[PDB]
Structure formats: C-alpha cells, structure tokens
C-alpha cells in the first residue's frame, strides 16, 4: 500500500535532526545530519520491503519495553524500520541541536513520544515528550519543533566526524540505534514504533533515508 510511515491511527509526516548556528545577526546557517520530508504517496511507488523484527531485537533493548514485548502488544501495523544515511559534512560554540518532527492523525489526542538513544543494544539515554493535537485540513497533527539533542548525542557527534575515515564512522553507526514509540498518553495505546538505524553517507550526496515495514511472520 502506502510507502507512508503511518499505522491507522497516526503517521510520521516530518523528522530531521539538525545543527543551526548564527553567522552574523541577520543570517542563520542549519544543518540537516537526518531529514525525512512530507511527500505524498505516488500510485506508481513500490510496495515497502519487509524486514523481520526477530533479526533487530537484539540491536533494541529487550525485555519490558523492548522490542520484542512491544510487537507483541502492538499493533503490527505500527512498527516500522528506518535507515538513515546521514550527513557529517557540515566549528562553533553556542550552536544549537536540535530534533524537529510532525505527525498527523484522524482523531485528536495527547501523545507521549519516547525517544531512546542505545548503543550495542542498550539504552543510554531516553526522553518523554507530551504533545497535543492542532487542527489542519482534513487532519490533526502534532508537532515537536526544536527538541534540544540529548548532550551524549552531541559530543557522539562531534567525536564521529573527528574519524579519518567514512568506515570506521560506520563501523561505529553499526552498534548505534534510536527506538521511538508514540502512545496515547493515557490509554498507553501504541500508535507507532519506528527503529531507526544509521550508516554515514559514503557520498556528498546527503541525507538519505529508506522504510521498511517491521513483520512477524
Ligand atoms: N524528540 C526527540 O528526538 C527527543 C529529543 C532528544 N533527541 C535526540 O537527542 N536525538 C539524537 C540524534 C537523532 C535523533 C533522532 C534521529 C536521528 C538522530 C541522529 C542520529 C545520528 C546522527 C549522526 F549520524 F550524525 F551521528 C545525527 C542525528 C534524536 C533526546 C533524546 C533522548 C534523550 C534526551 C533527549
């Protein structure tokens, strides 16, 4: 069907993460290191590849709130794969880091959106974000404007592009994962879970970034 990161009740509509430093007083520079656009489904656009959850547990915490339990509760529909090329070609104190996203759904609702930072597995580092419902044509969405980065995330950042080599960046992103799962707030109902995992882009080309659905056959 869609290529869209939707389940029924709620789709992923913008994510970027990006650096934004001030030149001088009128002029602002900003960085996407992730970017994922608002695009419209094509009717021509393939169907999205499957990828099965058994094989990326291990790179998500386990046990409660792990992965496995998670998709177990569900629904299916809800979970969805990301993999990001992203962009270290960007030196300034008092830049900002940052973490912009959308998402739109039929029904208004107060969604908490948990973030997890892991590395090797294991959660470093984890946020709870409670946004609410605007109204839009046709739709409701939810919008995290400028969530300031976590400070390991930062100094990951700065270290990684410190590496001679694109390689051993990505022999590094290999172990580096971020788990985010939307619930409505009060009935803890999952609404969407997206896996994301990282490999430096290799080119000048820029942010890139592919989905897959998530199964369980
Ligand atoms: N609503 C949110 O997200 C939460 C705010 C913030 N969120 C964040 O810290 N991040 C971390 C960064 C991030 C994020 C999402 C997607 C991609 C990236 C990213 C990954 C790799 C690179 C690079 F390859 F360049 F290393 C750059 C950006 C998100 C946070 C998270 C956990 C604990 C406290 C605060």
């Known amino acids: 069907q869609d290529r869209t990161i939707a389940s029924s009740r709620l789709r992923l509509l913008e994510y970027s993460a990006f650096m934004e430093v001030q030149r001088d007083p009128d002029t602002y ?3 996407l290191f992730v970017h994922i656009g608002q695009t ?3 009717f021509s656009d393939p169907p999205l590849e499957a990828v099965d959850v058994r094989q990326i547990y291990d790179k998500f915490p386990e046990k409660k709130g792990g992965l496995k339990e998670l998709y177990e509760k569900g629904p299916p529909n809800a979970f969805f794969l990301v993999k990001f090329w992203a962009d270290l070609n960007s030196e300034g104190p008092g830049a900002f ?13 107060t969604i908490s959106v948990s ?3 892991c590395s090797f597995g294991k959660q470093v580092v984890e946020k709870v974000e409670t946004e609410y419902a605007r109204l839009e044509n046709g739709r409701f969405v939810y919008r995290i404007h400028r969530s300031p980065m976590c400070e390991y995330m930062i100094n990951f950042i700065h270290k990684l592009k410190h590496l001679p080599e694109k390689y051993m960046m990505n022999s590094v992103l290999e172990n580096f994962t971020i788990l985010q799962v939307v619930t409505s707030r009060d009935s803890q109902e999952t609404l969407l879970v ?3 995992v990282f490999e430096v882009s290799t080119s000048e080309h820029g942010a890139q970034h592919h989905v897959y659905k998530l199964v369980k056959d």
């Open 29 to 31: 520079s900003k960085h």
């Open 40 to 42: 419209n489904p094509a």
């Open 97 to 109: 880091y940052g973490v912009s996203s959308q998402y739109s759904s039929a029904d208004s609702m």
């Open 115 to 117: 973030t997890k930072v």
């Open 194 to 196: 997206i896996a994301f």
